[PDB]
Each structure stands twice: as C-alpha cells, then as structure tokens.
Amino acid sequence: EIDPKDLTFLKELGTGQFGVVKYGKWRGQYDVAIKMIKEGSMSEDEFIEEAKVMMNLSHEKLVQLYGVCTKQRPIFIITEYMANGCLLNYLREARHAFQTQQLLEMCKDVCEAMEYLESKQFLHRDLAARNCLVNDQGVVKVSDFGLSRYVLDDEYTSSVGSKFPVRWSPPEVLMYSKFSSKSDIWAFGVLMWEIYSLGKMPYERFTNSETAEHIAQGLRLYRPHLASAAVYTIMYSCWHEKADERPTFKILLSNILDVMDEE
C-alpha cells in the first residue's frame, strides 16, 4: 500500500482499458506510471486481493508493480515507468531502422519474462506487442500480465467481442475456451511475427472471423521477409495444432539463443 502523499502527478500518458494513465514521481525521486482506475471498468476487490501475488512477481523483463492506492476511489496502480512507451508504436516508427539482431533481442526480452511467468504457473492471456513496453535503454518488458481477469467490458472478455485478442489466440481458445501455458506460447509466436514484420496486424487482409476459420483449417501466418528460415521455424513451432506439441518458453529461449549464435 503506497501512501498517495508520496505521489506527484506530472503528465498524462494516455488512456487504456482501465482509463487514464499518468506519469509522475514517487517520493520525489522515482519515475512512475500511474493507472487511475476508472470506476466501473475493473473488478476492484478481486484485483486488490491478487495484487499481493502480482507484487511478488519480480523479473527484469516484467514491468514492475511498485504498489497500489486502495484506501480511496479511484484506486491507483503504480508501476515502473517505460520512457519509450508501447512496443507496437515503437515497431511502426520507420526511423528506428532496426537491424534483425535488435528484433531478435526484443523477442528474447519477452521470452525471458514469459519463461519466468511460466515457471510461476502464471498466465498472461493477452500477450501482444501492444501489451509490451519499451524503456529508455530500448529494453522490452511485458506489461499488464494477469490483469485481463479483472476487465468488466464484455467486448473484451467474450470470444465474439470486438476487443477480444482473436488474432493472437490458438484454435482451442476460440472454439473451446481452453486456456493454458500453450495459449500464451501461441500468442508469443504471433508477437514474434509482429516484431519481424515491424508492427503489421496479423492476418492483415482477413477479418477476425476469417482468421478463426483460417487457423482451424491448419493454415498459418506467412514468413515475414526479415525472418530467416530458423526464426520462422521458432515462431511456427508455437502454432502446432496440438497444444502439447508446442514448445515451452524455456525451449524457445534456447532456440532464440541458438539463432543469435548462428546468424
């Protein structure tokens, strides 16, 4: 529990699923981002109880939760500050003119965070470039892991909703609501595709409906130009029709390191 007296709001960073997000200072020294939770957007009591578990989740490649302000409405979620914002927008800026080695490093950053979460049996459920952030040193970190469970918007949580992550979901999620470590694995493969295609929308010429049909037929995303045979094999391995044939994040990390050494 952070005392709100220790927080200074400085600028607005934008709006997400839970409302306004601000940049500020913690104890007059530390850069922070602060979610101001819009009343009605979150299952607040449930979040508050889980907050402890999530505060114990500490990894260099996870956006660090610093604390909460819950003795007030609206409640605050105080986190690490990531100066360069959203990985998706970051990818779409042509000026960065990324080398492929830099692209693979983004993949490795995320894979490292996901391996940690996997070892803690903790699912993200909404892994995508939009939900990764970039700090001042170009380091990519995974944001809002596990927070999907507290969203009240039916357009987001329902498979047929307009905001559901259809293009990042394996067939068994869309057809059966079968969520597992292997559904996070699938989404990671799609994230790799996002990175290597420099922020293109997956299945960019299809609707959400057509995408579901496509992956049910055993068909998959094409190799991004910038991805080698080896890089494509890795992301593709994440998209095996049988969930238990998909790799673990530990195996993926090993494969990424291999490619780094080889290419």
Ligand SMILES: Cc1c(NC(=O)c2ccc(N3CCCCC3)cc2)cccc1-c1cn(C)c(=O)c(Nc2ccc(C(=O)N3CCN(C)CC3)cc2)n1
């Ligand atoms: C994270 C974030 C959001 N989005 C959400 O809050 C949200 C997203 C999904 C969601 N769902 C439900 C739960 C499961 C996942 C899906 C719920 C909430 C909105 C606005 C800012 C930040 C933000 C945060 N943090 C922790 C930051 O550090 C940060 N930093 C920024 C830094 C710079 C910019 C910026 O303005 N630019 C423009 C100039 N460029 C040079 C740099 C980037 C923006 C954000 N922004």
